[PDB]
Design an enzyme around this catalytic site. Structure first.
Site, mmCIF file in Angstrom:
data_model
loop_
_atom_site.group_PDB
_atom_site.id
_atom_site.type_symbol
_atom_site.label_atom_id
_atom_site.label_comp_id
_atom_site.label_asym_id
_atom_site.label_seq_id
_atom_site.Cartn_x
_atom_site.Cartn_y
_atom_site.Cartn_z
ATOM 1 C CG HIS A 14 -6.484 -4.493 7.153
ATOM 2 N ND1 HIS A 14 -6.805 -5.336 6.113
ATOM 3 C CD2 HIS A 14 -7.634 -3.874 7.491
ATOM 4 C CE1 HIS A 14 -8.090 -5.172 5.802
ATOM 5 N NE2 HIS A 14 -8.611 -4.307 6.641
ATOM 6 C CG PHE A 15 -5.703 0.386 2.612
ATOM 7 C CD1 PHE A 15 -6.922 0.401 1.955
ATOM 8 C CD2 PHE A 15 -4.974 1.564 2.682
ATOM 9 C CE1 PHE A 15 -7.401 1.567 1.381
ATOM 10 C CE2 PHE A 15 -5.458 2.729 2.111
ATOM 11 C CZ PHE A 15 -6.684 2.735 1.490
ATOM 12 C CG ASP A 16 -11.084 -1.653 7.374
ATOM 13 O OD1 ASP A 16 -10.944 -2.901 7.357
ATOM 14 O OD2 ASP A 16 -12.108 -1.099 7.761
ATOM 15 C CE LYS A 76 -4.810 -7.106 -2.433
ATOM 16 N NZ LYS A 76 -4.079 -6.172 -1.569
ATOM 17 C CG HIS A 100 -1.904 -1.206 1.140
ATOM 18 N ND1 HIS A 100 -2.923 -1.328 0.212
ATOM 19 C CD2 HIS A 100 -2.026 -2.281 1.960
ATOM 20 C CE1 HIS A 100 -3.559 -2.484 0.415
ATOM 21 N NE2 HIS A 100 -3.036 -3.082 1.465
HETATM 22 N N1 LIG Z 1 -8.831 -5.486 10.694
HETATM 23 C C1 LIG Z 1 -7.939 -6.345 10.191
HETATM 24 N N2 LIG Z 1 -6.719 -6.382 10.762
HETATM 25 C C2 LIG Z 1 -5.766 -7.319 10.193
HETATM 26 N N3 LIG Z 1 -6.142 -8.085 9.010
HETATM 27 C C3 LIG Z 1 -7.368 -7.938 8.516
HETATM 28 C C4 LIG Z 1 -8.240 -7.068 9.093
HETATM 29 N N4 LIG Z 1 -9.374 -7.127 8.381
HETATM 30 C C5 LIG Z 1 -9.227 -8.027 7.400
HETATM 31 N N5 LIG Z 1 -7.981 -8.536 7.480
HETATM 32 C C6 LIG Z 1 -7.443 -9.568 6.530
HETATM 33 O O1 LIG Z 1 -6.013 -9.442 6.361
HETATM 34 C C7 LIG Z 1 -5.771 -8.861 5.057
HETATM 35 C C8 LIG Z 1 -4.707 -7.752 5.251
HETATM 36 O O2 LIG Z 1 -5.235 -6.485 4.900
HETATM 37 P P1 LIG Z 1 -4.839 -5.916 3.443
HETATM 38 O O3 LIG Z 1 -4.257 -4.522 3.565
HETATM 39 O O4 LIG Z 1 -3.769 -6.829 2.940
HETATM 40 N N6 LIG Z 1 -6.172 -6.175 2.569
HETATM 41 C C9 LIG Z 1 -7.055 -5.167 1.979
HETATM 42 C C10 LIG Z 1 -6.987 -5.235 0.449
HETATM 43 C C11 LIG Z 1 -6.088 -4.121 -0.001
HETATM 44 C C12 LIG Z 1 -6.916 -2.916 -0.433
HETATM 45 O O5 LIG Z 1 -8.133 -2.954 -0.195
HETATM 46 O O6 LIG Z 1 -6.310 -1.976 -0.976
HETATM 47 C C13 LIG Z 1 -8.498 -5.502 2.368
HETATM 48 O O7 LIG Z 1 -8.852 -6.700 2.245
HETATM 49 O O8 LIG Z 1 -9.221 -4.560 2.763
HETATM 50 C C14 LIG Z 1 -7.153 -8.430 4.540
HETATM 51 O O9 LIG Z 1 -7.235 -8.546 3.115
HETATM 52 C C15 LIG Z 1 -8.075 -9.420 5.168
HETATM 53 O O10 LIG Z 1 -8.018 -10.640 4.458
#
Ligand SMILES: Nc1ncnc2c1ncn2[C@@H]1O[C@H](COP(=O)(O)N[C@@H](CCC(=O)O)C(=O)O)[C@@H](O)[C@H]1O
EC number: 4.6.1.18
Length: 124
Positions: free
Chosen positions: A119-121, A41, A12
């Site tokens: 994590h990007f929410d 992705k 990110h």
């Molecule tokens: N709070 C939470 N805290 C930790 N992990 C979480 C949480 N919540 C979910 N995960 C899980 O761990 C992954 C790490 O977060 P990403 O930044 O990689 N993934 C983004 C897509 C990127 C985008 O949107 O630009 C997303 O899925 O929103 C999540 O995909 C979910 O499977």
């Protein structure tokens, strides 16, 4: 393995430029950050702010995460971001993305010591 904080920077963070110029940014960035390896992705956001500015979000506006944890934070300021989203026609291994530049608030989940994004929410 790769820490959550390191994966976040890989997925990110792009402090390089202040915005997306070319329409192939996403195509290029998604490849180089190892996000097209086994699959395309489908959706990903890059943040074009300094790492310090992004890490500072962890002391800004506390909000719920999508998953219902309460360790998420919204940035007070809008930030320069690029949304990459796979085209309707994209097929591995020729992953194809549309690049969209925006200025929006980001929401990140923070954890660990130091307390940094893992994590990007969402953007809003
Ligand atoms: N709070 C939470 N805290 C930790 N992990 C979480 C949480 N919540 C979910 N995960 C899980 O761990 C992954 C790490 O977060 P990403 O930044 O990689 N993934 C983004 C897509 C990127 C985008 O949107 O630009 C997303 O899925 O929103 C999540 O995909 C979910 O499977």
């Amino acid at each position: 393995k790769e820490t959550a904080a390191a994966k976040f920077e890989r997925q990110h963070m792009d402090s390089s430029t202040s915005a997306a110029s070319s329409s192939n940014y996403c195509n290029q960035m998604m490849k180089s950050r190892n996000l097209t390896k086994d699959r395309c992705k489908p959706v990903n956001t890059f943040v074009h702010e300094s790492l310090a500015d992004v890490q500072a979000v962890c002391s800004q506006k506390n909000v719920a995460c999508k998953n219902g944890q309460t360790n998420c934070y919204q940035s007070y300021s809008t930030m320069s971001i690029t949304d990459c989203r796979e085209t309707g026609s994209s097929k591995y291994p020729n992953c194809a993305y549309k690049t969209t530049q925006a200025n929006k608030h980001i929401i990140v989940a923070c954890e660990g010591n130091p307390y940094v994004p893992v994590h990007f929410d969402a953007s809003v």
